Amino acid sequence: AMEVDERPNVRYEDIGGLEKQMQEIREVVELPLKHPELFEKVGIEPPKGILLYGPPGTGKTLLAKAVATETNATFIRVVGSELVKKFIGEGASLVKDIFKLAKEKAPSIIFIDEIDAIAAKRTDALTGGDREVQRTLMQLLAEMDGFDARGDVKIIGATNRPDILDPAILRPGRFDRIIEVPAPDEKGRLEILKIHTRKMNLAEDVNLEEIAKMTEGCVGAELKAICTEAGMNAIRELRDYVTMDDFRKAVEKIMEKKKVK
C-alpha cells in the first residue's frame, strides 16, 4: 500500500539541523521540478531518483514532504515492506498502480520508505524465496528507466541500511544521488528543539541550549517526543506552562527507553 497526501503541509523552516542536505535536495529535486525547461537549456541532467540514508526518525520523510509542499506536488508515501507480497506478480502489480497514480496526480514525489525491503542484494543464486521480490524490484526499475524524462514526477528512496542495497539500483539513470541524513549534532538538536517548542508555552527557566547538550545522539523524532512528554509532565502537575524540570524528566525517560540493550 501507499499513503497519498495531495498537498502535504511541511515547510523547510520546520526541519531543523540539516542545512546542507536540505539545500542539496532543494537544488537536486525541487529546482528541476520547478524549472525543467531551464535544466534543459542550461545543459545538466537532473536525477530521476535520489536515495536518502541514515537512522529512522531523522527527517527523511520530512524533507520529501517539504519538497512536495514547496512544489504543490502530490505526496506519495510507499511502505517498502508492504510491497513484499508472497504471490506471483503481486509486488510488481502495486508498483504499477503507484506510478499510474503518480502520473495521474502529477506533479508528485514518490517517497519509498525502506526500499531495502525490495532492493536488498540477497546472497546469491539460491534465490527461491526472494525471487518474487526480484520480480518487483525489476518492475520499479522499468517504471524508472521508463516514463522518466526531466521532472514531472520525482522519486526519493530511503533506507537506514544502505550497504545491503543492490548496486544495480545505484547505477546512473536511477538513484544516483545518495544523501546521508544523520542523527543531528548539538547545534542541530537545538534547532529541532526550537521548532517543536515553537507553539508551546515555555517557562522562563527553560534553557533549550542545555537540553540539546543533554541529548547525545537522539534523533528528531525522539526530540519531538521529549517536547510532548515534557508538556505532559506539566499537565500531570496541572500546570499551564512547561518547566526546565519537566524536560529533565522527559529527557531522562526517553534516554532510558533508548537504552534498550
Ligand X SMILES: Nc1ncnc2c1ncn2[C@@H]1O[C@H](COP(=O)(O)OP(=O)(O)O)[C@@H](O)[C@H]1O
Residue positions forming the annotated binding site for ATP: 57-62, 196
Indicate which single residue of 96, 105, 177, 224 sits in contact with ligand X (rule: CB under 6 A): 224
In terms of Cβ atoms closer than 10 Å to its own Cβ (0-12, 13-18, 19+), residue 197 is: buried
Of 2 and 18, nearer to ligand X (C-beta) is 18
Specify the stretch interacting with ligand X by CB under 6 A; choose among 16-24, 28-36, 74-82, 169-177: 16-24
Residue pair 150/114 in contact (Cβ under 8 Å)? The answer is: no
* CA dist list (Å): 252 to 24, 233, 242: 35, 12, 16
Binding of ligand X at residue 215 (CB under 6 A)?
no
Specify the stretch interacting with ligand X by CB under 6 A; choose among 24-32, 39-47, 56-64, 129-137: 56-64
Indicate which single residue of 5, 31, 39, 56 sits in contact with ligand X (rule: CB under 6 A): 56
User: Smallest distance from the beta carbon of 193 to ligand X, in angstroms?
Assistant: 9
Of 15 and 141, nearer to ligand X (C-beta) is 15
In the DSSP assignment, the letter for residue 125 is S
Count of residues of this chain found to bind ligand X when the rule CB under 6 A is applied? 17
Binding of ligand X at residue 16 (CB under 6 A)?
yes
Three cell numbers written together for 121: 542484494
- Burial track 139-154 (b if 16+ CB lie within 10 A, e otherwise): bbbebbeeebebbebb
Specify the stretch interacting with ligand X by CB under 6 A; choose among 37-45, 59-67, 200-208, 242-250: 59-67
Residue pair 189/212 in contact (Cβ under 8 Å)? The answer is: yes
Indicate which single residue of 59, 80, 91, 151 sits in contact with ligand X (rule: CB under 6 A): 59
Residues after which the chain has a gap (C–N > 2.5 Å): none
* SS3 assignment, position 120: strand
Site string for ligand X, 141-180 (x = CB under 6 A): ----------------------------------------
Residue pair 32/156 in contact (Cβ under 8 Å)? The answer is: no
Alpha helices in 82-163 (DSSP H): 90-104, 116-119, 132-145
Of 138 and 221, nearer to ligand X (C-beta) is 221
Specify the stretch interacting with ligand X by CB under 6 A; choose among 54-62, 86-94, 123-131, 163-171: 54-62
User: Smallest distance from the beta carbon of 29 to ligand X, in angstroms?
Assistant: 16
Distance CA(109)–CA(253), nearest Å, equals 36
User: Smallest distance from the beta carbon of 79 to ligand X, in angstroms?
Assistant: 12
Indicate which single residue of 218, 220, 226, 230 sits in contact with ligand X (rule: CB under 6 A): 220
Residue pair 201/240 in contact (Cβ under 8 Å)? The answer is: yes
Strands (E) in the chain, as ranges, are: 2-5, 49-53, 74-79, 108-113, 153-158, 175-180
Indicate which single residue of 17, 151, 157, 231 sits in contact with ligand X (rule: CB under 6 A): 17
Q: Which residues bind ligand X (CB under 6 A)?
A: 15-18, 56-62, 192, 195, 219-221, 224
